Ligand binder design. Structure first.
Ligand SMILES: Cc1cc2nc3c(=O)[nH]c(=O)nc-3n(C[C@H](O)[C@H](O)[C@H](O)COP(=O)(O)OP(=O)(O)OC[C@H]3O[C@@H](n4cnc5c(N)ncnc54)[C@H](O)[C@@H]3O)c2cc1C
Ligand SMILES: Cc1cc2nc3c(=O)[nH]c(=O)nc-3n(C[C@H](O)[C@H](O)[C@H](O)COP(=O)(O)OP(=O)(O)OC[C@H]3O[C@@H](n4cnc5c(N)ncnc54)[C@H](O)[C@@H]3O)c2cc1C
Lengths: 356, 368
């Protein structure tokens, strides 16, 4: 059977890859794959709503083997680091949220080591002395989404998946899509995973797909020749600080309701620099190498949108908002199953399209 | 006669242009003209400031350049058929606390004797001239006859003009000064040589680093790093070149006609480093958003960093060296765009007459 995946960010690429891994034939339609939210994304993979939590822990459990399998097929690196994740808090408010977080994670078998202010500074010398304590998640990490999507693209190629670099301009009642150049592509199944543009595809029957509203996020990248920070760090007052091996240090992110605007603004960059310098005062001399902005794919109730629509053979896989890099593997596994079996794995039932 | 100008930022391009205008033949040596401090520069053309209070000679140099700027630009656009991006809509000096409002009183008294139009403005009048100022504005001064230039457009014109008048541009690095010959010259990185009747060094903070210079000839032109940024809106955000002071620190806000808004600048001692840093950009954004809170929505379009050419005593270095037929024209530090015209006029005279105009005597090389 043949599945057409509309949109090729981290969510359609992963989905398309796993569909191939399950012996399906796959076409991905996207004029510029891995160019949007997935391009600017930080790739923090923090452990962290019961249903969503369960979805995240499953994706978490799966991440290591997902990456292993992907590198094997692709002969490429996905840039997955498992050096643990440091949660650092700097005031009463934030130190209390850590207690809540640690209590939320103990029952579920997630390694979480509480750290007092001192222990925090020993794990990360570059933290400001105002640090009040933290949590260490030694089994967690972070990925470089740019490397992850590059691998997904390589793997999809190796397995003979087709990539069409054109815009899907219309959905056709088997299902298919019209492309901007006039050519058409039908398949046995169609999967929409076009981020915050999913619901904007002309020809979708009213009510089929809910509004995947964009949530803007500005983000920046600093650099030093040698890495500045020891490991993926969350500093709460939340700012995400993700060191790459080559000296890049990602700093995200703003969360904003600005429709589809992706302008990098004085306000946003000032917000981010303010946070990083408050908790990493030595970051003052790091080079500001990049500033960017992307759109998170939302949903009317803030949770992912996975499974069948009321339109036969039309599925969706979107609305991962703040954590799609994190949810990418489980989403891929889940949609694989759905396509092959016709049934919806238990862990995904909460995110059916029909709930609206 | 033939003059070789080493270095082609705003100071050698202007100098070279005026030398041509005076019928000299001119060669400019610079691998990438107008690429350094002159590229990042804001182009504020302020009359005077706290810095000139205890510096009568420099003040006199600045006021002369100020007087000359309008006609300099007129003459340059005429020769070049190009715009230099000189705006004369006046300059707004805005203050935001007691400290800064008092410094304005001092500044207004400093400028009245020198024939500089300066209109005091109360907090209300400030907000009427510039609606985007924060409501904490405490009062200002308007300098209606002052303005600002876009250095990028100014150097483009200088380059066009120099071309039109048959000046030669050699896009190579001068690697060595050739001393002790009938005439002075420079060796280039590609091995070719260029002599002239006069040589003028105007290579910013690299001037003193040219191999072959006799010891003591040129003093240390030490770099002073400055980061600067550019914001943008489709329609202009700020009405005119604005200086805002608060909490004992200043920021320059220079609107261009196309919506670009320049915001400078940091002053830092980092030798020759021109890295744009988290610290520097945070400094600048902090200042602009404090006094222009609406600037939060503006696009951050560009960040940059440049090296100001300094001098052992902080004043320009103009005139002859102890090496015969070897002149210099550098060390303008924070205000070379402002001083560019007068510097050009002055060096023209020096080359043609052999004498040093009175206004420039204070900046002789030999003072060290
Ligand atoms: C600043 C920022 C930081 C983030 N940090 C993290 C983090 O640290 N950890 C984490 O887990 N998550 C993070 N996220 C979230 C995560 O990056 C996103 O949820 C995820 O990238 C969504 O993937 P997606 O493929 O659904 O959408 P996208 O990556 O936006 O991909 C959608 C694709 O659809 C395509 N498309 C659009 N219209 C059409 C059409 N008509 N035809 C064909 N194709 C089309 C586009 O070209 C695009 O490539 C972050 C997001 C942002 C904005
Ligand atoms: C951030 C910042 C903001 C500023 N804002 C203002 C302002 O608002 N108003 C104002 O008046 N001034 C301002 N200035 C000052 C102004 O930018 C400088 O004083 C002026 O640029 C000095 O220019 P210059 O031509 O001497 O040197 P530069 O512009 O540095 O030019 C020197 C040139 O020499 C060339 N060169 C170097 N070595 C060699 C070699 N061996 N052979 C050949 N060529 C060589 C270089 O390539 C370069 O093009 C600012 C400066 C900075 C850094």
């Amino acid at each position: 059977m043949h599945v057409v995946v509309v949109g090729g960010g981290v969510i359609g690429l992963s989905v398309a890859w796993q569909a191939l891994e399950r012996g399906l034939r796959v076409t991905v339609v996207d004029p510029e794959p891995a160019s949007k939210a997935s391009h600017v994304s930080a790739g923090m993979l923090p452990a962290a709503q019961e249903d969503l939590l369960r979805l995240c822990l499953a994706s978490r459990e799966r991440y290591p083997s997902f990456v292993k399998e992907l590198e094997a097929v692709s002969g490429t690196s996905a840039g997955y680091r498992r050096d643990g994740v440091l949660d650092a808090a700097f005031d009463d408010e934030s130190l209390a949220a850590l207690d809540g977080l640690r209590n939320f994670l103990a029952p579920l078998g997630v390694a979480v080591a509480p750290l007092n202010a001192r222990r925090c500074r020993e794990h990360e010398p570059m933290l400001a002395e105002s640090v009040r304590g933290g949590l260490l998640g030694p089994d967690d990490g972070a990925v470089n989404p740019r490397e992850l999507t590059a691998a997904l693209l390589a793997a999809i190629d190796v397995r003979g998946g087709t990539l069409i670099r054109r815009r899907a301009t219309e959905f056709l009642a088997t299902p298919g899509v019209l492309l901007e150049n006039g050519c058409a592509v039908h398949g046995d199944r169609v999967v929409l995973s076009a981020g915050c543009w999913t619901h904007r595809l002309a020809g979708l029957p009213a009510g089929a797909v809910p509004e995947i509203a964009p949530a803007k996020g500005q983000i920046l990248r600093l650099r030093s020749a040698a890495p500045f920070l020891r490991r993926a760090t969350r500093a709460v007052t939340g700012v995400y600080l993700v060191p790459r091996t080559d000296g890049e240090l990602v700093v995200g992110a703003t969360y904003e309701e600005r429709d589809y605007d992706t302008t990098v603004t004085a306000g946003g960059v000032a917000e981010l620099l303010g946070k990083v310098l408050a908790v990493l005062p030595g970051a003052a001399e790091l080079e500001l190498a990049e500033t960017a902005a992307g759109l998170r794919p939302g949903s009317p109730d803030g949770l992912p949108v996975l499974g069948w629509t009321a339109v036969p053979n039309l599925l969706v896989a979107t609305g991962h908002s703040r954590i799609g890099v994190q949810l990418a593997p489980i989403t891929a596994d889940v949609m694989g199953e759905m396509l092959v079996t016709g049934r919806t794995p238990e862990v995904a039932k909460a995110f059916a399209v029909d709930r609206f």
